[PDB]
Design a binder for this molecule. Structure first.
Ligand code: HEM
Length: 157
């Protein structure tokens, strides 16, 4: 696999950068439990995604929302996300995603879990922005999702 491996150079055009940080912060700011609520949706649409987290597999949304493991996974998504959104520096991505990638591959979380995540956050963004989710917003975000997508999973040993 791993065509072109790691390179990336100057990733997104500045206008895409301006709009992906602004919107991530709009959402983070205005919707307090945003990231957990994204996970609580993924599990509705894809019940096996619940199963990759063995212990909580089989719980209802209300006792899903108060799980030490759910909350801790969610703020960890939250911090990797805010770390990148700070500068959208394409190549501090390699060390950021490095352990994530290994533990995800160990619990068999892959490509259709990342895809799903992207769909559900895309949705959240649109519920937030309204009619002013005018397509630069969608493109910049997909491009961001591609930069990130490009260098994910396994070389786990
Ligand atoms: C952009 C999305 C995501 C990010 C950045 C992310 C990040 C992380 C992080 C920080 C870890 C732990 C790494 C460590 O211990 O050093 C982790 C673990 C885990 N995550 Fe994710 N996650 C994401 C998406 C998902 C999705 C969508 C699933 C499953 C449908 C998932 C399932 C798990 C599982 C099962 C663990 C368990 C603990 C472990 O073995 O480390 N994650 N994730």
């Amino acid at each position: 696999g791993g065509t072109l491996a790691i390179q990336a150079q100057g990733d997104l055009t500045l206008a895409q950068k301006k709009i992906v940080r602004k919107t991530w912060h709009q959402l983070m700011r205005n919707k307090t439990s945003f990231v957990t609520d994204v996970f609580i949706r993924i599990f509705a649409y894809d019940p096996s995604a619940q199963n990759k987290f063995p212990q909580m597999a089989g719980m209802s949304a209300s006792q899903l929302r108060s799980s030490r493991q759910m909350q801790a996974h969610a703020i960890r998504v939250s911090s990797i996300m805010s770390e990148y959104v700070e500068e959208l520096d394409s190549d501090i991505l390699p060390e950021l995603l490095a352990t994530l990638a290994r533990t995800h591959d160990l619990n068999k979380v892959g490509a259709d879990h990342y895809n799903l995540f992207a769909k559900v956050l895309m949705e959240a963004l649109q519920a937030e922005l309204g009619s002013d989710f005018n397509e630069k917003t969608r493109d910049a975000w997909a491009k961001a999702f591609s930069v990130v997508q490009a260098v994910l999973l396994v070389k786990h040993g």
